Amino acid sequence: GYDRHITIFSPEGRLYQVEYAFKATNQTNINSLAVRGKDCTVVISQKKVPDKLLDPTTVSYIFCISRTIGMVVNGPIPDARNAALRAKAEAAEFRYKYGYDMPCDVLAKRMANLSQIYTQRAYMRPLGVILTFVSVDEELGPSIYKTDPAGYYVGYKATATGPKQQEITTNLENHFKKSKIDHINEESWEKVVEFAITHMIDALGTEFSKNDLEVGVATKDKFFTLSAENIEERLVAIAEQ
Amino acid sequence: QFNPYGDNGGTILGIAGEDFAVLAGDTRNITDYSINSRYEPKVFDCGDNIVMSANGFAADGDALVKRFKNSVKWYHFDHNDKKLSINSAARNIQHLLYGKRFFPYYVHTII
Amino acid sequence: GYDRALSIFSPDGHIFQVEYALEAVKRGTCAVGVKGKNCVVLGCERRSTLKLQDTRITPSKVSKIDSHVVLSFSGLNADSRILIEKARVEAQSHRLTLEDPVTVEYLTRYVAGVQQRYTQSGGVRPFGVSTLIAGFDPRDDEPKLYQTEPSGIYSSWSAQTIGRNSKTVREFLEKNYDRKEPPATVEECVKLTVRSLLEVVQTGAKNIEITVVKPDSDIVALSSEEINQYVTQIEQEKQE
Amino acid sequence: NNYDGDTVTFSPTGRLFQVEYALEAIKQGSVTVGLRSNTHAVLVALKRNADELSSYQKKIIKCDEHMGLSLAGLAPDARVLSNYLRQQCNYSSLVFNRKLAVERAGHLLCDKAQKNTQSYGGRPYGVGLLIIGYDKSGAHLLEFQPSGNVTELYGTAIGARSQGAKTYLERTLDTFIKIDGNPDELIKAGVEAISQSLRDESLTVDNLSIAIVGKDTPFTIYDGEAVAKYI
Amino acid sequence: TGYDLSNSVFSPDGRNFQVEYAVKAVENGTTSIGIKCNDGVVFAVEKLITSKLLVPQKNVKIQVVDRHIGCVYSGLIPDGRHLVNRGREEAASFKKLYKTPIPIPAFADRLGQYVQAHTLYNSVRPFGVSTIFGGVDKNGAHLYMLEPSGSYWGYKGAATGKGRQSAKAELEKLVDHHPEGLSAREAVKQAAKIIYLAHEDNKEKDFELEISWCSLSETNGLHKFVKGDLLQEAIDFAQKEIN
Amino acid sequence: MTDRYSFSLTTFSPSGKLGQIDYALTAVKQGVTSLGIKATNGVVIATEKKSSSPLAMSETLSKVSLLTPDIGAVYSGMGPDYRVLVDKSRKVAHTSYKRIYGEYPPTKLLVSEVAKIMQEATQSGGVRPFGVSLLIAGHDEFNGFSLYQVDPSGSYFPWKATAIGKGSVAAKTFLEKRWNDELELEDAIHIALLTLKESVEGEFNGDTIELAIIGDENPDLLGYTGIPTDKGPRFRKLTSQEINDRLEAL
Amino acid sequence: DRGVSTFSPEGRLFQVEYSLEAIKLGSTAIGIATKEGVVLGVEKRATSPLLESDSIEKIVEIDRHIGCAMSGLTADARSMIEHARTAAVTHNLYYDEDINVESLTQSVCDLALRFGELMSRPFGVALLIAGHDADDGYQLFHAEPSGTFYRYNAKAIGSGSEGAQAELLNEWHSSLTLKEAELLVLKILKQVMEEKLDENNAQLSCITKQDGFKIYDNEKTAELIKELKEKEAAE
Amino acid sequence: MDIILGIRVQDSVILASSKAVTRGISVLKDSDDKTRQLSPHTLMSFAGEAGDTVQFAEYIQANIQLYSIREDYELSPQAVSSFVRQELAKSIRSRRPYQVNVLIGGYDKKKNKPELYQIDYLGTKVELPYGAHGYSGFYTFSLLDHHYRPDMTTEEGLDLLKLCVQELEKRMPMDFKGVIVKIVDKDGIRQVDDF
Amino acid sequence: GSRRYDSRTTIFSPEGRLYQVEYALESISHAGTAIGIMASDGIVLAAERKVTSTLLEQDTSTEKLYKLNDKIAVAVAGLTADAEILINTARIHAQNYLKTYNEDIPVEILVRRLSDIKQGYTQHGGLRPFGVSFIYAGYDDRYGYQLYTSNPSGNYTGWKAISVGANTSAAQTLLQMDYKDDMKVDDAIELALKTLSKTTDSSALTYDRLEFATIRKGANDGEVYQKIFKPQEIKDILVKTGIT
Ligand SMILES: [Cl-]
Ligand SMILES: [Mg+2]
């Protein structure tokens, strides 16, 4: 039974090392959510600092890949940073060679193609991570593209990743079934972040302090992460209506 | 164009006696019409009762003497501290010199 | 590159891949070598399980390495071709540098060297081939017959056989071959070689190949009828 | 058990069995003692013969004029590691006109041994070394294990029954450290130390191997009638 | 089963058992700690005196990277040295190209990506060390701890080895009792105490205390070993607290 | 490091079976149904856009891909394996043909190049076979319209019409009854939609069905005028609206 | 399976220990070092009477002042001999002198442990390297596939080794003549050989300072065998 | 090397090649055979830079002898010439090209026809009734153009070749110490020992 | 490390057989039967396509009979993909020889080259062998009309008539029974089709299940023509010989 140790086909036509890499994805016990506004793409992720000896500022699963592209990771931090460094290198090289900023969906495909190679080549193991890339692309506009250890990737209206992804997914599905539009019809990114946090609270059924969340925001020509005080301002607005 | 060679002048003299040998050399180091040093030793004790001087381009001279001294050290290590005979030292130096046949040491060597 | 050590020692001090290579030789069709006083004869078995065979074009069992040396074999046919090619290249390479054709001993020593190399090189299996290398050294009238085997050991033989039922024909040669008086003529040497194969072959039809090598690059392969005359004369003397 | 097939595999308790098996090869090897004062450092090595016709396997190797080691385990591995030390000692002298510090020599041996314990295909070194030397910070004694662990000591012993010699040095620590400017008395202490590791056999003229390096003493090996003085 | 025999193999759990086995080697090692102070960091390690024959203060365990970074580790000492050797190459190539000495967060990822790389293939073994490192850069003091998995975080206090539970409890007290922060000289004293307290898990053999520190005020942001009077003062403070 | 898997992971079993190829074909069997039908004046290739989530934008995932202006490809099996094969197929069409002969390869030769890449994954060191079967439809001046299947083994066969994946056995029987050598492209599209409806459980519309044709030259899709010989691509992907229009005449 | 360079729990390399078992199956080779010269003798052990025994080359010249006898998988020795010959000639080219017998032996033994996953396995052959140099006089060495070499006053390797070595233990003294050594090798070979010893199934050789390395004629050995039989019948 | 001539008559090819080997000031040898037998019925004469000529000639010989053994078959003169041309064509764009010009005189046993091929160091091959390399053609071709007939006997070929050598000995400044003449026919290669 | 997963494709069994070669031959034994018959005035190549469909485009299909040059063709039995790798190598080797010697490659030299490539995969590399057996039908001006076969071992042999693939035992007995040396192409065409018709695992032998080719000096005067039969031409020869 060495068909379960390396990336070769089982008699059922399955790759068990890919399936087990998907299970490593939920090892952090963190839930992420991504939604699209009119002018922005917002990504929120649970932040858990269980040790008091940890510097909480250094605990992050959101990465600034390029000026335009942001990436949240669901999975262990070593594989997350492995994927982050490569994505940054790929984004920089693309700009140098082709003379324009790497689109979100093109980077997603590139990282997915790299993930595919690990599922076909035996000496390389899959990375135990799901990568959610966000940007406001200059052609496609607000963009969410997610990659997994299988080498699969697709564009999303909104998405959720982690142990309780299904509860968040169904919550988002129900909202977009009402509104009958592919985005959050909101002008300011501040209110799109407030929507994202509100619908995670509803789905998970847990309240959040400023230190319990981690927020990334993609606008035209820059992606940036919110400070604890920027999130606090967001949590105050939610509570006041 | 870069010229990798130079002339540091100097003169050396080796005379073989009946039961002795002398290797002499002036201590003047020069370039063109300038004196670099009035005392720059040119004849060296290499151990195993061998004295050696590589006269001409001082850089290539120092390099060759250094590599031979090193060859004496490794001869001891490899062959149970056997004394390197003058004839064996000579044949060894031929291979050091011919090793750079197509980028020679601009030195006339006497041991 | 593939570096896996396939030929390795076992607890009892045996290299099984080399020993299993000999089992491939044991399966191969019987080859025999007999050196007379002024000639060497290479006999080779052709298994009659294959008829409708085109004997014009089918690879012959005896191969010329140079104009004066020949190589027959027992074992894997595909493996033999690689040794024959290497030998033929080394034969011309020797003529080019030494300005003299290879000695039979030198050509043997080379082929044996190649076989040995494949028994302690990474990512390669030994040759499933034993060879009989026969001929005459340049400007020499002394017959030469050598044997090699997958392990890479080689030695000179007054007469030797390799392949399937080689035990039986070696039994025959050991009692029939006199060292003090070897087969004096070509006839006597060919007769003793055909006789030795008839102990094993089955039918003396197209199952026996005979190649006679004489001094000064004089190599000829006997035809069906020429061999058939030897087969006829042997059994008519036996009916007594 | 299932985790001793190669050096690249940790056991469930976080052990490297191929390294521990390499360590075992040292324990099978003949006893060798190292000890130093403030002026001199001494190696004493019990050489092992195959039989009565055979020579006694040399244990001590010279690395430079100011450094050398004694070996216990696979002799060919000791030749590889000593050859590497010779080169590093030589590189320091040629490039920097500088005698290689004994402590730095240890660091280099450690790093060379380590690479063989973390890579597939390779094997650990099957030898332990006692490196003595006199550099710009006085006399030094090092103990090298093929795990990569190098330790600076006053005295030690490695090989079969080495524990006997190691206990003696641990008792004599305060005495032999003070033997300054007396090479003969420091060797006597080393010969008396290795004597605590002998059973059945005793120190004969072709059995005993001694080396010494010090303040005004190049690394010199004593064999044959040269060590009869100390028997 | 058999998922634990080869490195880089996901178990049905989604775990790399070979990395988890490397952690067992770390847990088996001597206690090493790190304390982030006001304007720098302090590193301390427990050195077990196996025998009287060990030359005191000679077998140095803490290693400097560049001139501004200190590294200490618990577990397989050679693996720790191999990682520091790589760290020195990473720090040299960074300074060569970018002129400025490597920032601590930048340096942390260089070690992190390297250790993680040894969990990607079955042809290499994971690192048998947890490394506590850090120093002072342009953005101030930074303390990090790096595990065999390649996982690292920033820390206020860090501990690893056999007496890590004991140490961690002591570090957590300092964090609670000093929210405003700890001075470099205080951190050296506290480091000495914590190693002495964490020595109860290794109480069979007596030990030797080794401390180093980078501090903007005390060492000009350079890594230095705590020697002579300042070391004895920290040993005296530590010995007073256990009694 | 180094790729130390320099040996075959696909080997012959005592029975003469290549296990990893058989298991790759099993992975294809589990894959969503795709089909191809060849008409007199065109070819059609169709498949179901099996959306993993309703939040996912299934327009961004292309199951039917342009390889050259006159050649298109659809698959059944592992999507990621297909995506990298399309990237390699597009490049090899340039490197090993267009950059040599100054024209796009004929359908059969591009198929042959794709087949070769999939064969090598079946014999090369330290790799598994591709877990996909491809249906490649194409037109070239001298061979006309053609439809090819390519299997994980690297084996390829030309078809008049066929289906691969989930409900291939039932689909192929359906095509056998409907196919003749006098079908117009519109008749083939009609049959393609009928055949594909059987294997689809849920929604059946232009948003859940991906369908492309190899038909007449599209000068409107060329992107430039002025060169009479350049008349535009024969590959055209049908829009969500164009499919829905033909589902009313179904 | 398991690594080729793997250590056993006892701290021995499996493949080296297994190669030593292959050498035990080898034909007997004996060396005796005297102050008048070193004698090398081998059992030829022809598998069949049709095998021309003079073609069995188990004693080999490395240089004029160094001979070599082999026991075990004799095919493996060819590359070892080639290296030894090259090393001997190469040193003469570089230093205009003969190479020390120990230095030659050390050069051969450096190949031994160059195996892994370099060659795929250790050598399956042991060598008795006998020679003379000005520094250490007449010398006999035993080169193993472990990479270890011992200097011997007398040594036997192969199938009859431990029986022969016990005999060499009793017989050897520091005052042996070259003629006494020749008979002693012949005596011990005859003892451990399956087939009856003659000049066709056994071979003698010697290395003297004056004449260098010489493989003995079958006629010369035949006389020494006849001299042996008479002196054993003499008491 | 200096003069190499070739003439293809009815039933044979004749190759004349100078005997002189000059190294600058002195004539070192006056009996040099500037030819190699590639196969029993194929001869190749050569002239060009010192060392390269023999090194190339022997290299070709070794290759054709290797083919002969492998296939137990003699390559046609056309096949040998095509091989030689490719080696020279390969050579001209090498780091240091073979500076060697060759005439290949062979008798094709299949077609029962003599064949003469002229190949220069660039790999410029031509089949000719008569050929030369260097300045040899300038003196001789005017005579060959006049006298040559395709139905000439071997004896007539040798007589026309003597007239060519005589014209060279008259008007050439260099003393080439006469020529070694070799005939290639159905019975193989033989040397005319009196010329 | 990686050793754990290595099948070791290039090792001997205790009996002295090559595991992968033997198992590759077992693979080929399930492939469609290919027959070659050599006559005095040409060679015939007949081969059975494996259980086809009514929707397979036969006229543009080729799985059995391939052209190496204008003088040499091959019939394939085994993995079609593996064959096309070797066929492309053989086609290049033929053109390499033509460029070098300005003469068409002799049949045996091409066969030996391909056979030596197959041999390599059994001795070194640690890769699986090519699961292919070839029947080489060719003409050169040395030996004239020649039939050869090569198998995954890299061993090749010459034949007057030979079969590869399924039911070779049954096929070779029928050929050995009805073959004669003075036989002509038209006769050899009939024998080939009659042999397949009896050894086929199918209910009946039809045009859509056959690939057919002839190498004739039936080319106007002193030259050789290759004829890869069209589906309609295979249907005609089936009616002529009286099988349908
Ligand atoms: Cl890509
Ligand atoms: Mg993998």
Residue numbers in the entry:
A (entry chain G): 2 to 242
B (entry chain L): 1 to 111
C (entry chain C): 1 to 240
D (entry chain E): 3 to 233
E (entry chain F): 2 to 244
F (entry chain A): 1 to 250
G (entry chain D): 1 to 117, 125 to 242
H (entry chain J): 1 to 195
What does the paper say about this structure?
The ubiquitin-proteasome system responsible for degrading misfolded and malfunctioning proteins in eukaryotes plays an essential role in cell-cycle regulation and apoptosis. The proteasome 20S core particle, the catalytic core of the system, is assembled from four stacked heptameric rings adopting an α1–7β1–7β1–7α1–7 stoichiometry. Natural products featuring a β-lactone moiety, such as omuralide, belactosins and cystargolides, have been proven to suppress the proteolytic activity of the core particle. Their uniform mode of proteasome inhibition relies on opening of the β-lactone and transesterification upon nucleophilic attack by the catalytic N-terminal threonine (Thr1Oγ).
By contrast, 1 is well defined in the β5 subunit. Superposition of 1 with known complex structures reveals a similar conformation as observed for the class of belactosins51,54. The acyl-oxygen atom of 1 derived from β-lactone ring-opening is stabilized by the oxyanion hole (Gly47NH), whereas the generated hydroxyl group is hydrogen-bonded to the carbonyl oxygen of residue 19. Similar to NH6 in belactosin products, the carboxylate group of 1 interacts with the threonine N terminus and displaces the nucleophilic water molecule, thereby preventing hydrolysis of the acyl enzyme complex, and explaining its inhibitory effect. Furthermore, the isopropyl moiety of 1 at the P1 site is stabilized by Ala20, Met45 and Ala49 in the ChT-L channel. Without nitrogen atoms and extension units, 1 might feature the minimal scaffold for proteasome inhibition.
